[PDB]
Swiss-Prot record:
Domain Bromo: 9-113
Function of the molecule: Regulatory subunit of the ATP-dependent BRF-1 and BRF-5 ISWI chromatin remodeling complexes, which form ordered nucleosome arrays on chromatin and facilitate access to DNA during DNA-templated processes such as DNA replication, transcription, and repair. Both complexes regulate the spacing of nucleosomes along the chromatin and have the ability to slide mononucleosomes to the center of a DNA template. The BRF-1 ISWI chromatin remodeling complex has a lower ATP hydrolysis rate than the BRF-5 ISWI chromatin remodeling complex.
Subunit annotation: Component of the BRF-1 ISWI chromatin remodeling complex, at least composed of SMARCA1 and BAZ2B, which regulates the spacing of histone octamers on the DNA template to facilitate access to DNA. Within the BRF-1 ISWI chromatin remodeling complex interacts with SMARCA1; the interaction is direct. Component of the BRF-5 ISWI chromatin remodeling complex, at least composed of SMARCA5/SNF2H and BAZ2B, which regulates the spacing of histone octamers on the DNA template to facilitate access to DNA.
Protein name: Bromodomain adjacent to zinc finger domain protein 2B
Tissue expression per record: Expressed at varying levels in several tissues, whereas a smaller transcript was expressed specifically in testis.
Family, per entry: Belongs to the WAL family.
Subcellular localization, as worded in the UniProt entry: Nucleus
Lineage, broadest ranks: Eukaryota, Metazoa, Chordata, Craniata, Vertebrata
From-to range in the entire protein, with total length: 2054 to 2166 of 2168
């Protein structure tokens, strides 16, 4: 509360460490469904159904331009990528499996780096 604060966590490396995680997600072989924004002209249903599209290129540009105020907003956009994928794709499809795999990969790196 006012004039009453928990000890200050060192957050000076968060930006660098989120960039490294993101690099590792970008270079995973199952990243291909997530690298670029879904083409809303060419994929029927996507525009109407997925209210907040998100992809790795968009996260990279937000990251690079100071549009994440903290590491929780970064994680929210990563998770959004996978939540969108689950909304639109059957579990038993290449893309569906890609999204489960990438989410697992992310969550491990996130835990190991920050928890």
């Amino acid at each position: 509360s006012m004039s009453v604060k928990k000890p200050k966590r060192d957050d000076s490396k968060d930006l660098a460490l989120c960039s490294m995680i993101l690099t590792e997600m970008e270079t995973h072989e199952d990243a291909w469904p997530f690298l670029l924004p879904v083409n809303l002209k060419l994929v029927p249903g996507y525009k109407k159904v997925i209210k907040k599209p998100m992809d790795f290129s968009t996260i990279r540009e937000k990251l690079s331009s100071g549009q994440y105020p903290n590491l929780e907003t970064f994680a929210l956009d990563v998770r959004l990528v996978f939540d969108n994928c689950e909304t639109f794709n059957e579990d038993d499809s290449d893309i569906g499996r890609a999204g489960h795999n990438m989410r697992k990969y992310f969550e491990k790196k996130w835990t190991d780096t920050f928890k």
